[PDB]
Amino acid sequence: VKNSIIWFRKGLRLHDNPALLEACKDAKHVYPVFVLDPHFLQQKVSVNRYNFLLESLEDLQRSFQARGSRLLVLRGKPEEVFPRVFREWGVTQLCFEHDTEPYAKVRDAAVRRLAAEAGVEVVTPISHTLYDTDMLVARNGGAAPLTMQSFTKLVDRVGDPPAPAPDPPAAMPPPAEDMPSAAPAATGVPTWQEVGFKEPPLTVFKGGETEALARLEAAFQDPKWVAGFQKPDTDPSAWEKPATTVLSPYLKFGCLSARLFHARLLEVYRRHPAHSQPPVSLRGQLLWREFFYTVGSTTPNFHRMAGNPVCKQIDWDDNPEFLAAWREARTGFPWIDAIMTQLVTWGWMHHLARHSVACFLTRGDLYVSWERGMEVFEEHLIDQDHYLNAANWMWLSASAFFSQYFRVYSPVVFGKKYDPEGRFIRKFLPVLKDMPAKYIYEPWTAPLEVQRKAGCVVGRDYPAPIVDHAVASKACIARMAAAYRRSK
């Protein structure tokens, strides 16, 4: 008889899940599995992101229970767990969604070898990306496009991505009873307290497929907003109602299918002939993700500077004091510090808020390596995504993809154009809540009488600025110019 495992890693959803559909086909028993390394922390990861994963697993558990089944959260390393459960459960087929990250390729090769030793068929459909990204490279002559313009031309020659797969059946084949490795007490979803976090998550975005689909429907309630979306024109200071979809955490974990999102976009576009086009359109945003997955997966050492063939070698400074001030939201520039507080509190900030703080750290003011900023984002972002974090940090530091290092955002002026009253600053830096708007982006310029009346004395309640932007940005531009000459 057929006994199958559907192994979740990403792809934390029932919709558009061809791996799950294959596992269920003609099966007597299906074992839905997630493998949790219970020593992960004792090795880097904020409770915000880890709890988002746990909420996503709890949602899957509820969905499987509604269909007569159960999610099994196995503790250990895949290479140690799977040989045991292959034999225990009489497994004949293992299904999982393909993953192109570096660690995944090593892990999955090991599991494939073990499956073959046990006589287990392995099925690995592509559904985390819009397309088979190896197919895109092949149809481009064997190399990934290195500009968005050429990437968009390639996908348009290839055509539409595959349609989302059908929903799974209303009843699933359950795990077999009295299998020791499937014991309830050994296979439940843990809480954040149980995995060892001491402080609670503070983010406002809840994990899981159910929430992902609800947020998708909310975005599409206004088709004119979807059709006319232009990413560069959206407001980074909007926090009560964010100005973009905030689907990124859901896409990162696969709670939302990218193919479903794309299909829904095309439905709207067919009815709105003046809809925006790539790169600025909402379809364009999914193509930025696809572009960076395609380049990233075919480039060695993509997450590093040294040994990375697409990355310019730049003389970044090893300045721990500047990195600490940035990481701890005590730069003395309220726009920067508010965004860095949103990072640690919510784990998500608007794209142009990410631009502001990444420019400041690297080529704009402090001249610290983008790899250090990437590490801080990797800890705190609930949408942390290996290829997308690396690629956008290389863009913002003018190390790859982007080369216009004379464009430097002002940490004072940039936010003021959207939010002159500083509502965003006041929300995330309440020490400044009573500062008059005239000084809230530049509090060190307020007279002492004003600082005292506001209960915010610079140097006592809120730090002085760690640099003078005019001085620092001129120095950084000169160094970038010199670095660009050296790589001639």
Ligand X SMILES: Cc1cc2nc3c(=O)[nH]c(=O)nc-3n(C[C@H](O)[C@H](O)[C@H](O)COP(=O)(O)OP(=O)(O)OC[C@H]3O[C@@H](n4cnc5c(N)ncnc54)[C@H](O)[C@@H]3O)c2cc1C
Binding to ligand X (CB under 6 A): which residues in 146-175? none
Closest separation in Å from C-beta 387 to ligand X: 9
| List 288, 302, 326, 424, residue binding ligand X (CB under 6 A) | 288
Residue 13 in contact with ligand X, rule: CB under 6 A: no
Residue 358 in contact with ligand X, rule: CB under 6 A: yes
User: Of how many residues is the chain composed?
Assistant: 488
Q: Which does 377 bind (CB under 5 to 8 A by kind): Cl ion, ligand X, none?
A: ligand X
For the chain, the distance separating the N- and C-terminal CA atoms, rounded to the nearest angstrom, is: 64
At residue 379, φ and ψ (nearest 5 deg) are -70, -45
Residue 393 in contact with ligand X, rule: CB under 6 A: yes
Residue listed under structure tokens 């559904």: 127
The alpha carbon of 199 is separated from its chain's Cα centroid by a whole number of angstroms, namely: 22
Residue 283 in contact with ligand X, rule: CB under 6 A: no
Closest separation in Å from C-beta 412 to Cl ion: 9
Q: Is the peptide bond before 279 cis (omega within 30 degrees of 0)?
A: yes
Q: For ligand X, which is the closer residue by CB, 330 or 351?
A: 351
73 close to 190: Cβ distance less than 8 angstroms? yes
233 close to 350: Cβ distance less than 8 angstroms? no
Question: Which positions ≥6 away from 126 have C-beta within 8 Å?
Answer: 97, 98, 132, 133
Q: Which does 410 bind (CB under 5 to 8 A by kind): ligand X, Cl ion, none?
A: Cl ion
Structure tokens at 31: 């074992």
Binding to ligand X (CB under 6 A): which residues in 237-256? 244-248, 251-252
**34 - beta bridge partners?**
8, 73
- Alpha-carbon distance of 181 to 183, in angstroms, equals 6
> b/e string for 377-393 if b means 16 or more Cβ within 10 A?
bbbbbbbbbbbbbbbbb
Closest separation in Å from C-beta 426 to ligand X: 22
Q: Which does 384 bind (CB under 5 to 8 A by kind): ligand X, Cl ion, none?
A: ligand X
Stretch that binds ligand X, among 173-181, 282-290, 324-332, 472-480 (CB under 6 A): 282-290
- Alpha-carbon distance of 410 to 419, in angstroms, equals 14
Closest separation in Å from C-beta 470 to Cl ion: 13
- Alpha-carbon distance of 13 to 1, in angstroms, equals 26
Feature table: binding site: 231, 244-248, 285-292, 348, 351, 354, 383-385, 389, 392
Binding to Cl ion (CB under 5 A): which residues in 394-453? 409-410, 414
x/- letters, 188..227, toward ligand X (CB under 6 A): ----------------------------------------
Q: How many other β-carbons are positioned within 10 Å of the β-carbon of residue 77?
A: 13
Feature table: binding site for FAD: 231, 244-248, 285-292, 348, 351, 354, 383-385, 389, 392
- Alpha-carbon distance of 41 to 276, in angstroms, equals 44
Q: For ligand X, which is the closer residue by CB, 159 or 232?
A: 232
At residue 104, φ and ψ (nearest 5 deg) are -60, -40
Residue 389 in contact with ligand X, rule: CB under 6 A: yes
Q: Which residue is nearest to ligand X (CB)?
A: 244
Binding to ligand X (CB under 6 A): which residues in 314-353? 350-351
Cα angle: 214, vertex 384, 55; to 5 degrees: 45
Q: For Cl ion, which is the closer residue by CB, 332 or 364?
A: 364
Residue 356 in contact with ligand X, rule: CB under 6 A: no
Q: Which does 3 bind (CB under 5 to 8 A by kind): Cl ion, ligand X, none?
A: none
94 close to 5: Cβ distance less than 8 angstroms? yes
Residue 289 in contact with ligand X, rule: CB under 6 A: yes
* Binding stretches for Cl ion (CB under 5 A): 409-410, 414
* Binding stretches for ligand X (CB under 6 A): 231, 244-248, 251-252, 285-286, 288-289, 292, 350-351, 354-355, 358, 377, 381, 383-385, 388-389, 392-393, 396
